[PDB]
Amino acid sequence: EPLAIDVHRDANCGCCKDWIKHLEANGFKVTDHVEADMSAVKSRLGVPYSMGSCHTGVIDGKFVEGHVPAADILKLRERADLVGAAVPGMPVGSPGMEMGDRQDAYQVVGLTRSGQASVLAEYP
Template sequence: MRRLVLLTTLLTGLAQAAEPPSIDVHRDANCGCCKAWISHLQANGFQVNDHVETDMSAVKTRLGVPHSLGSCHTGVIDGKFVEGHVPAADILKLRQRPDLLGAAVPGMPMGSPGMEMNGRQDAYQVIGLGRNGQQQVLADYPGK
């Protein structure tokens, strides 16, 4: 009986590990780059729950996104905000950071996921917001 319980626990853990990460994305109905970012997430194994909103400012306020870190869409994963065009790999890293409330790519930098247009790539950073209110650079992407 004990072996059966251990085997069941092991198999359940493996099944959970294989499940794709799920993220809620809040966006305006008419935003094309938001849809492109969602495609980026899906292409990188995320299950996206798409929420079309009429008042994104209210969503950002409710989720604690500072105005200085604002962008067009806001995701939520594991209770943390993901603001703007954050690359999927950096979202996975955010999940491992209990000291952070969220991460953001402020503005809409060309070349970031969902903003790939005309081959242009601006430099941008992924900024983390700590539980203490301090901001820190989590990733630095150079321009081309």
């Protein structure tokens, strides 16, 4: 099939739409909607409490929380031990949150079912 991701996103959030455009430019087929019950979406997918962000994607059963770069979504897909990856919050400089030369340091955090956190990528 075409590579595809479904995105549940915060209402009135411009960065989520920009992140979707970066994914599309990376070849992802994206479907999305503004979310009515984001607590339900995140808790059903197993996104940890303080790892939430402004949108939640779902690809091949695994969650993509926040402004995860496309290349790290591909790494998520090929790690059988991981059920999701998160960039908590909204760090400036992450894809869809970019605003000039500046960047909040951030990590893409992979998560196992056992609750283990495994860093997929670090950005200065």
